[PDB]
Paper text:
The mutant proteins Y37F, Y37A, T36A, S52A and R46A were crystallized (the latter in two different space groups) and the crystals diffracted X-rays to a resolution of 1.5–2.0 Å. The KD for the R46A mutant was ∼30 fold greater than that of the wild type, showing a much weaker interaction with the OM operator site, and consistent with a key DNA-binding role for this arginine side chain. The ΔΔG for R46A is significantly larger (8.5 kJ mol−1), and that for the T36A mutation must be larger still, since we could not measure any DNA binding activity of this mutant protein. Both R46 and T36 of C.Esp1396I are seen in crystal structures of DNA-protein complexes to interact directly with the base pairs involved in sequence recognition, specifically with the G and C bases, respectively, of the C-box recognition sequence GTC. The movement of the Cα of residue R46 between loop conformations I and III is ∼6 Å, resulting in an even larger movement of the R46 side chain. Since R46 is a key residue mediating DNA sequence recognition, this movement allows the recognition of variations on the consensus sequence of the C-box. Five of the monomers in the asymmetric unit are observed to be in loop conformation I but the sixth more closely resembles that of conformation II, which is almost identical to that in the DNA-protein complex with the 19OM operator site. Both of the R46A crystal structures and the S52A crystal structure have adopted loop conformation III, despite the varying buffer conditions and crystallographic interactions in those three structures. As with the high-resolution wild type structure, the C-terminal tail is also involved in several crystal contacts with multiple monomers in the T36A, Y37F and trigonal R46A structures.
The most widespread of these mechanisms employs a “controller” (C) protein encoded by a gene downstream of its own promoter, and usually co-transcribed with the endonuclease (R) gene as a single transcriptional unit. The C-protein binds at various sites within the C/R promoter to regulate transcription of its own gene and the associated endonuclease gene. Unusually, in the RM system Esp1396I, the C-protein also represses the MTase (M) gene by binding to the promoter at the transcriptional start site, denoted OM where the C/R genes and the M gene are transcribed convergently from different promoters. Flexibility in this loop is very important for DNA sequence recognition, as it has been observed in the nucleoprotein structures to adopt different conformations depending on which operator site the protein is bound to.
Author numbering:
A (entry chain A): 3 to 78
B (entry chain B): 2 to 77
Write the structure that this text describes.
Amino acid sequence: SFLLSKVSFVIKKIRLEKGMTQEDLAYKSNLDRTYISGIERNSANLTIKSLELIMKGLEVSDVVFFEMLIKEILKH
Amino acid sequence: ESFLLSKVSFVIKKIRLEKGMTQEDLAYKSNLDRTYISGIERNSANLTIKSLELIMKGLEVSDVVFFEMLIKEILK
């Protein structure tokens, strides 16, 4: 899936840009490290509530996240 | 429901009504249950990214269009 891969990519990109490991983001959001690893491989079951929490943890606003996402969708 | 949650629900229903589609129409076109559509439009907490992909495919709305509308609603 095109959208799933781009969501996964943007979450990994923002996490790596904040210098956070998957563990770091998990600890900040009270999620497991394997949930973050999992979403970066396949974002199918990531919910909007979990994405809001992740965006909170990455200290990215929702608008910037979606701007980043539109950019990735359009690059393709 | 947070404001991101509410706005995702709002934008789905906004586009659905602009498309002249009922909930049942969206359910048919997305291959999701009408109960689930009903629920998302009230509260998007448990909407997954795959279900959002199928909702956009059933509304026949470009993903970029959906996220641009979402950014505009978040900013209002």
